[PDB]
Write a protein that binds this ligand. Structure first.
Ligand SMILES: [Mg+2]
Ligand SMILES: [Mg+2]
Ligand SMILES: [Mg+2]
Ligand SMILES: [Mg+2]
Ligand SMILES: [Mg+2]
Ligand SMILES: [Mg+2]
Lengths: 113, 348, 64, 274, 113, 93
RNA sequence: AUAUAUUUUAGUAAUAGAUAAAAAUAUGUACAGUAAAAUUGUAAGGAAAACAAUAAUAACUUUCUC
RNA sequence: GAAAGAAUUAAAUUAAUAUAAUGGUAUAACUGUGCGAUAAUUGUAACACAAACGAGUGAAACAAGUACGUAAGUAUGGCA
């Protein structure tokens, strides 16, 4: 006899973060083999086509008319925003830094070049 | 022979250099080109054979065509059509081609390239479309100065800026340049070169330099800042350099505040926009407009809202972008602005 | 053994060195990489000696 | 590489950015090849083309007159058929391929003053099959082609592999040359006058030859090439000589129109037409 | 090193090649360049005009044919039918030759068949 | 086994610097079978050629309009139609 | 026309185009383009070597012209 | 009315992807070409995915240096 008793395990390749879900920077929204979902707004894409969040926000799945026949995952900076954002409106940006109210810290920062 | 006549036609259509003109129009290939300044090089040079007679024939052909066009041009009443006819007549003139190609378009001398003349203006427009306009568009799109400030641009006027008063050096700013705080310490100089047919006497303009990237920590985002605001400026095709000479203190809706980027706040886009005024009929002379100076604010400035209010149309744009350096504190001190904030290096 | 290991020693004489793999008869492998002792990009060269598959030096000067 | 995800970003303006012009890399390349300042400059309209002039004067009007069919409407070709929506599986389904063919066929227009048939291009494909043994034979064939045309040939390489015929893949084997405009016209004139009459039992081009749409072809043996005046003048210099295929491409809607056009330029046609 | 056949092949190759056979680049003065441009542009315009003239003439001929055929259809149906036949295998006569540079010894043949 | 010319390193034609192959060509006069001359540009150095067998003397191109030679030469006194009629009895075949 | 001297040419070798599905540098970046099959043909060529051809132009810009 | 350009629409990922099979890829990840041969570099790597541990995977950001690109930027080996 000779049996075909050999197989790899399942690659855990679902969506790891869902519509309306809060995200943090670095977090993986999708694991996939090839771009089933394309990286949308405020979202990066890795070597393994893994969509990850570039900013803190709300994960949103959407279609964009500019790219028909392509699904997108992006991260809205608030829950208020429809994440296929209006084209000619200005981009919702995050400053994401804090001023150094502390005097010593500010001085150190000024010194550093 | 319409192109030899200068009774009704401007002086600019001729070549001002006499030697060059003589070289162009001779009966044999005897003379040597004025372009080649050096004797040895002239000796070395040999122009292609038979070029003269054929050239003369071509001139005659195109001169005839121009004359025919002129027959139509004078009968025409409406202005844009007339201008187009004039362009058609003179665009193939060798002399005007020589003038345009081989002399400066930016700081045009009126006798050589007159932008009051329609043909020369058309040529200048074409030149702008070929390179400078495309570049400007690229810099607006890539840096994200269009959607962030003002939705779109349909580039009509070529806008070039300069910073003569601060340092001393002469340099037209390439769009999307990084300028030092020393360079942009004092105000800039605009040159709004208009290529469309427009009423020079009536048409006024406004110029707004806006900084979309100043950080607002309440919103955790950015806000706009009107760094320099002029209104009701008069341009002329040749007389178009917007300098403290031209505009009065009444024209300044918001007088120049310099780029003073904060440490680690990032790179700050400064995108000048040039709008033309709405032109009112049944009113001789330039129609002014009053700006509510308490209503518009400098620390936060809705450009789009402002445009909507005064019914402006953005014809031109230019952009530089400043970031923090050692001298920004000195600039602030000179202007009497406060010490200036310092942010964390990490965008956490 | 088809692919052998080699030691690339930094040309700026720090002592820093990086190791890479090559085919047995591959050309001499020099590469410019960051030397952290010197804090710059420097040339690396093979410290040891080894035999090479001798390619005919292609002649740009048109011979004969 | 952090990723392979290709995704062109949309823009916020309608100006067409020519990216080539914004660089300062290839200043000679910014000029058109027609422009004198380009190193690629070549005098195009050097002398009056004779065959072309003849076509313009005599033939074109005659051809138009021939091809007039009264109130002739357009004949649509075989195209990809859409599905009837009589099932919800038709909803994003690709269209059925054409009726007879796998590839779509073009519409045949009525001939009017605009779309009169005329010569478009000649291509002279010479694939020498002995060059599977000897690469130098390909070179000689290319030279011959150049001599014949006065135009630069392009080398043909073996695209396929096969054992029965001793043929490798990626081996230089003969050459080709697409003639266009005045050189092509000259070549046709030479064919009509010098070469094809010196072929002994030459009936003509077959009427069964051709594409379905405005393309006619034939071939010359190695015996026939020695009648070309460039080859004939030095028979010592040309010991070997290679046959060739000659693809004539017309601006004809159909093949009978193309045949008629070629006849106008003194090409004989012998076989029973389709 | 090389055979006589190899040598002859090399010579043949050289005939086709641009190696050390081509002159210097055609440089012009600015005035000369302008003159050239004006020559070329004018020529191009002339060619366009000629094309339009010929094209116009062809259009006029087509219109005349259309006018004729309608009239024929109106008057005599049989004549119209005869006119409007498929001329699929129509061949230009072999006497209508492509006009040479200079004429032959016998300009015209008065007898035939 | 395969006869070849082995390639040297190729010369780098830079982008923009590529020049079109304008081969050396002479204006050559072809006189056809009849006296009709035609000018054609040609690469071989010969200003004038006169052709013997052309379309202008081929029957296919105008329908409306040396062993044999040796034989004629050495059977000339006999003068070899009448001769055909004499030597053509079609009974035997 | 011919002699000597001093040079110059002839080492004859392919890409001429940002080349684009013959073969060849498999990682970077910048710019650009589209394959395949099947069908109709064509010198040896044949089911199977190579080359050609095979969906639609409404609107827009420029040019010439009635 | 004609010529040229810009192109758009339809179709296609059946070819091609160093290599199995699957998913992805013409907006090309496929192919050609210039430069290059550098990022098949150096210290800190949060946060995620996966996950008994040992390991494995994607990776923002900070700092040093390099290559290409007018620029925007891209590159810490290869469509996965
Ligand atoms: Mg599994
Ligand atoms: Mg697949
Ligand atoms: Mg878990
Ligand atoms: Mg662990
Ligand atoms: Mg790969
Ligand atoms: Mg790759």
């Amino acid at each position: 006899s000779r049996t075909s008793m050999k197989d790899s395990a399942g690659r855990r390749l679902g969506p790891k973060k869902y519509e309306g879900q809060d995200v943090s920077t670095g977090e993986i929204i999708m694991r996939q083999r090839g771009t089933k979902f394309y990286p949308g707004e405020n979202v990066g894409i890795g070597k393994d086509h893994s969509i990850f969040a570039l900013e803190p926000g709300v994960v949103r799945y959407y279609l964009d008319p500019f790219h028909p026949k392509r699904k997108f995952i992006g991260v809205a900076l608030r829950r208020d925003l429809k994440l296929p954002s209006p084209h000619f409106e200005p981009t919702v940006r995050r400053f994401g830094r804090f001023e150094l109210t502390n005097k010593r810290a500010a001085y150190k920062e000024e010194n550093s070049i | 022979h319409i192109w030899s006549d200068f009774t009704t036609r401007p002086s600019s259509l001729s070549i001002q250099s006499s030697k060059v003109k003589n070289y162009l129009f001779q009966k044999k290939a005897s003379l040597d080109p004025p372009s080649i300044s050096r004797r040895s090089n002239r000796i070395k040079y040999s122009p292609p054979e038979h070029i003269d007679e054929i050239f003369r024939m071509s001139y005659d052909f195109l001169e005839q065509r121009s004359s025919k066009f002129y027959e139509l041009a004078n009968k025409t009443k409406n202005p844009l059509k007339k201008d187009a006819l004039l362009i058609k007549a003179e665009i193939n003139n060798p002399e005007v081609q020589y003038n345009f190609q081989f002399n400066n378009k930016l700081n045009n001398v009126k006798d050589i390239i007159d932008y009051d003349v329609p043909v020369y203006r058309h040529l200048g427009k074409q030149h702008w479309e070929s390179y400078g306009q495309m570049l400007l568009m690229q810099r607006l799109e890539t840096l994200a100065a269009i959607p962030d400030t003002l939705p779109t641009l349909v580039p009509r006027a070529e806008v070039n800026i300069k910073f003569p008063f601060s340092t001393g050096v002469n340099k037209w700013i390439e769009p999307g340049e990084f300028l030092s705080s020393n360079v942009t310490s004092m105000r800039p100089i605009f040159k709004i070169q208009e290529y469309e047919l427009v009423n020079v006497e009536k048409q006024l303009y406004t110029v707004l330099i806006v900084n979309p990237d100043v950080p607002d920590l309440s919103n955790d985002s950015f806000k706009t800042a009107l760094c320099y605001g002029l209104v009701n400026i008069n341009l002329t095709y040749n007389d178009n350099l917007i300098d403290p000479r031209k505009f009065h203190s009444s024209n300044i809706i918001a007088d120049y505040l310099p780029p003073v980027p904060e440490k680690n706040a990032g790179k700050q886009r400064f995108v000048v926009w040039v709008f033309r005024q709405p032109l009112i009929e049944d009113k001789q002379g330039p129609n002014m407009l009053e700006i509510d100076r308490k209503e518009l604010s400098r620390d936060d400035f809705d450009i789009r809202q402002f445009t909507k209010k005064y019914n402006l149309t953005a014809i031109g744009a230019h952009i530089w972008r400043s970031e923090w350096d050692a001298k920004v504190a000195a600039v602030r001190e000179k202007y009497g602005l406060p010490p200036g904030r310092v942010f964390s290096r990490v965008r956490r | 053994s088809k692919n052998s290991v080699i030691k690339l020693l930094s040309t700026a004489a720090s002592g820093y060195s990086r190791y890479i793999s090559i085919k047995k008869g591959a050309p001499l492998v020099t590469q410019v990489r960051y030397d952290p002792v010197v804090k710059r990009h420097v040339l690396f060269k093979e410290a040891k000696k080894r035999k090479v598959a001798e390619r005919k030096p292609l002649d740009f000067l048109r011979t004969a | 590489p952090k990723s392979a995800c290709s995704l062109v970003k949309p823009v916020h303006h309608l100006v067409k950015i020519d990216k080539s012009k914004l660089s300062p890399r290839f200043p000679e390349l910014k000029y058109d090849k027609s422009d004198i300042r380009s190193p690629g400059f070549k005098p195009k309209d050097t002398h009056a083309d004779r065959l072309n002039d003849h076509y313009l004067n005599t033939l074109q009007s005659d051809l138009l007159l021939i091809n007039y069919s009264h109130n002739a409407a357009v004949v649509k070709g075989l195209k990809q058929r859409a599905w009837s929506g009589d099932s919800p599986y038709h909803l994003n389904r690709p269209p059925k391929n054409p009726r007879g063919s796998k590839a779509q066929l073009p519409d045949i227009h009525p001939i009017k003053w605009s779309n009169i048939p005329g010569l478009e291009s000649v291509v002279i494909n010479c694939f020498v099959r002995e060059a599977r043994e000897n690469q130098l034979l390909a070179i000689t064939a290319a030279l011959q082609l150049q001599q014949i045309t006065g135009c630069k040939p392009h080398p043909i390489f073996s695209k396929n592999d096969v054992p029965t015929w001793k043929l490798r893949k990626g081996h230089q084997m003969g050459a080709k040359v697409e003639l266009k405009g005045k050189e092509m016209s000259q070549f046709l004139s030479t064919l009509t006058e010098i070469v094809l009459p010196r072929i002994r039992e030459y009936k003509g081009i077959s009427n069964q030859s051709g594409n379905r749409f405005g393309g006619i072809s034939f071939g010359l043996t190695a015996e026939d090439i020695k009648f070309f005046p460039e080859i004939d003048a030095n028979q010592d210099s040309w010991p070997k000589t290679f046959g060739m295929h000659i693809n004539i491409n017309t601006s004809a809607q159909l093949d009978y129109q193309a045949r008629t056009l070629l006849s106008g330029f003194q090409f004989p046609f012998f076989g029973e037409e389709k | 090193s090389l055979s006589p056949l190899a040598q002859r092949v090399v010579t043949q190759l050289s005939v086709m090649s641009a190696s050390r056979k081509q002159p210097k680049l055609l440089k012009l003065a600015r005035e000369d360049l302008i003159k050239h441009q004006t020559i070329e542009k004018c020529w191009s315009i002339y060619q366009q005009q000629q094309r339009e003239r010929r094209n116009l003439q062809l259009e006029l001929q087509y219109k005349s044919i259309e006018r004729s055929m309608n009239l024929l259809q109106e008057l005599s149906p049989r004549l119209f039918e005869a006119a409007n036949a498929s001329e699929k295998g129509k061949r230009f006569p072999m006497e209508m030759k492509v006009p040479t540079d200079f004429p032959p010894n016998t300009l015209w043949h008065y007898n035939f068949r | 086994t395969r006869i070849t010319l082995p390639r040297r390193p190729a010369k780098k034609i830079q982008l923009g610097k590529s020049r079109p192959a304008i081969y050396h060509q002479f204006n050559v006069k072809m006189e056809l079978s009849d006296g009709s001359v035609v000018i054609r540009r040609s690469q071989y150095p010969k200003g004038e050629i006169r052709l013997i067998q052309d379309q202008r003397n081929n029957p296919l191109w105008n329908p409306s309009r040396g062993s044999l030679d040796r034989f004629n030469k050495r059977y000339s006194s006999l003068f070899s139609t009448v001769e055909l009629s004499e030597e053509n009895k079609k009974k035997t075949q």
